[PDB]
Design an enzyme around this catalytic site. Structure first.
Site, short mmCIF file in Angstrom:
data_model
loop_
_atom_site.label_atom_id
_atom_site.label_comp_id
_atom_site.label_asym_id
_atom_site.label_seq_id
_atom_site.Cartn_x
_atom_site.Cartn_y
_atom_site.Cartn_z
N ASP A 151 0.82 -1.22 0.00
CA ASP A 151 0.00 0.00 0.00
C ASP A 151 0.85 1.27 0.00
O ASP A 151 0.49 2.25 -0.65
CB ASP A 151 -0.95 0.02 1.20
CG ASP A 151 -2.10 -0.94 1.06
OD1 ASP A 151 -2.42 -1.39 -0.06
OD2 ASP A 151 -2.71 -1.24 2.10
N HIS A 179 -5.59 2.82 3.72
CA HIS A 179 -5.47 1.36 3.87
C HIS A 179 -4.23 1.00 4.65
O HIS A 179 -4.30 0.25 5.62
CB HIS A 179 -5.44 0.64 2.52
CG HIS A 179 -6.62 0.92 1.65
ND1 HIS A 179 -6.63 0.64 0.31
CD2 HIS A 179 -7.82 1.48 1.93
CE1 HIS A 179 -7.79 1.01 -0.21
NE2 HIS A 179 -8.53 1.52 0.75
N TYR A 207 -3.74 -0.76 9.12
CA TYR A 207 -2.96 -1.83 9.76
C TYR A 207 -2.29 -1.33 11.04
O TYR A 207 -2.28 -2.03 12.04
CB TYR A 207 -1.93 -2.45 8.81
CG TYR A 207 -2.58 -3.05 7.59
CD1 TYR A 207 -3.38 -4.19 7.69
CD2 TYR A 207 -2.42 -2.48 6.33
CE1 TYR A 207 -3.99 -4.74 6.58
CE2 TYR A 207 -3.03 -3.02 5.21
CZ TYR A 207 -3.82 -4.15 5.34
OH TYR A 207 -4.42 -4.70 4.25
N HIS A 252 -10.53 0.38 -7.65
CA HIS A 252 -9.22 0.78 -8.20
C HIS A 252 -8.81 -0.14 -9.35
O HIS A 252 -8.38 0.34 -10.40
CB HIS A 252 -8.12 0.78 -7.13
CG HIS A 252 -8.37 1.72 -6.00
ND1 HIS A 252 -7.54 1.78 -4.90
CD2 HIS A 252 -9.36 2.61 -5.77
CE1 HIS A 252 -8.00 2.69 -4.06
NE2 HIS A 252 -9.11 3.20 -4.55
#
Ligand SMILES: [Ca+2]
Ligand SMILES: [Ca+2]
Ligand SMILES: [Ca+2]
Lengths: 303, 311
Positions: free
Chosen positions: A82, A116, A120, A210
């Site tokens: 990411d 995104h 985490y 996406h």
């Protein structure tokens, strides 16, 4: 018309300064699909703080040190991918846009892939010790099989072929993270970390768009090319995907070493390799046996 | 420690492949200012459809064709500047970041300046005719004084001097749009287009942070340089600002020709030119007379953005 004798700023900046610049026009648009995508991704805005990941603490405490390590490692590896896409990949698409709105949509994509990656960290803050977090970062830096995947794709973003750059931009959300996404869904299918899987589903709600959008724009550009150039690009796509699958298999076998999950994760990954190809306008060569996902895991993916 | 023997992906892509890549680490943050800024700009997310300007129709319909044209032109010009910053300027900052979180913050900026540009279209959709919208686009393309301004900044974004690029990225939200922002606040101080000014205040709530942040990162980098190089950069900043002020003056006199607003707009612009310098760690040379703004206009400029408009 003013539009046909002016250029967008990004075209001025990187391609052609012979004509003056036009402001974006959202009151007359070239492609209705851009407005549909813009509205969906902006209305789907979310931040990780609004999922109660703290409610995963009991089921996290049911998992041993090895499982906790696997999850932290898996997610830190997804964080790397990411970070690549937010900071390099999606922003590199802006200057190669077909339309004005597309330039703004890729800015949204780069930001949301940032969110995104950030999510985490929220999960780690809620569940992991600082040493678990640090170990996973060390492991990611030092895992050559992991590193090989972004190292293969990054050159397309920095080189001067817009179609190859676009293919990489589709491959990242379309394919490369699914081997890791298998883990949270495997776990939530067994009643582990249900709130984490809600974050994963928010991430996928973006990533599927996406992949679709980059594939859509790829198809528009390649359709203008000669049959020979079209065949050349198709050959490039299938060759690159073949290489990336090879790298993904090696990495997943290392990641899941000791747990037995790699062969299921690889099938889950290949299902999405087929979806990636379909979103570029090609047919998937992968069999039902090669892409088999257990019903309980597919239920988590498709919720 | 892993961090000191690895590089971020964007560093790997563009500058240094001697070490492997590290994932962004949001658990151990190098500069807590980044987290503060990240949290504020993401919490401030808004979309222009949530601030309908249908209630501006009565006051809009009171304005003559010349005033309506002025507003459409002014806002289409501001749309161009936002298009420049969203598609070129802010994303060009990503690779020059000092920290990992800064890379993500500039991605947020590029997106949100895209939203700023989008917002004018929602205003035009409610208030303007098709002909007014198209005429303004034609006018922006053909107005050389307007064009000269983004044309002066873009080369810094595409060139390889990160500090000059950073200065440009601060100058855009810090200075270049305020000459145009004078118009909606002049109007709303006289009870005209009040809802439009709510959108402008939401835009400014972002842009004030964009200017602060770029100015902050500029200062951190220039503090590391030799005194000679610091002196060189200071001279570049004041020289570039002087150029941009000259270009802005010419454009605003054309924009506001026949309305008499240009001299007030220029003072309003120079007030923000001073703040731009201050956010870069320099002293403003502009006098109180040169930067004088009327309280009724400043009241509109300084009013808090309405939290009800948040997403
Ligand atoms: Ca904690
Ligand atoms: Ca197995
Ligand atoms: Ca006057």
């Amino acid at each position: 018309n003013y539009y046909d004798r002016s250029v967008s700023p990004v075209e001025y900046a990187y391609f052609d300064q012979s004509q003056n610049m036009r402001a974006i026009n959202w009151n007359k648009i070239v492609d209705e699909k851009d407005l549909e995508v813009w509205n969906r991704v902006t209305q789907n805005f979310w931040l990780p703080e609004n999922i109660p990941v703290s409610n995963d603490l009991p089921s996290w405490n049911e998992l041993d040190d090895d499982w906790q390590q696997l999850i932290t490692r898996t997610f830190t590896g997804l964080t790397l991918l990411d970070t690549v896409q937010s900071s390099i990949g999606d922003v590199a698409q802006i200057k190669n846009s077909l339309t004005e709105q597309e330039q703004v949509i890729y800015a949204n994509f780069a930001f949301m892939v940032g969110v995104h990656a950030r999510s985490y960290g929220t999960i780690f803050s809620t569940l992991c010790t600082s040493e678990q977090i640090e170990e996973a970062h060390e492991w990611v830096v030092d895992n050559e099989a992991l590193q090989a995947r972004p190292k293969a794709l990054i050159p397309f973003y920095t080189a001067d072929d817009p179609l190859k750059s676009k293919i990489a931009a589709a491959l990242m959300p379309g394919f490369l993270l699914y081997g890791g996404f298998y883990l949270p869904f495997y776990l939530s299918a067994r009643g582990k970390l249900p709130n984490t899987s809600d974050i994963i589903r928010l991430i996928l709600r973006d990533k599927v768009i996406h992949n679709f959008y980059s594939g859509y724009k790829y198809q528009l550009k390649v359709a203008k090319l000669s049959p020979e150039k079209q065949a050349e690009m198709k050959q490039f796509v299938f060759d690159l995907l073949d290489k990336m699958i090879g790298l993904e298999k090696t990495y997943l076998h290392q990641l899941y070493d000791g747990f037995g999950l790699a062969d299921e994760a690889i099938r889950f990954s290949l299902y999405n390799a087929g979806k990636f190809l379909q979103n570029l306008g090609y047919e998937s060569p992968f069999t039902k046996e090669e892409t088999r996902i257990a019903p309980e895991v597919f239920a988590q993916l498709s919720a």
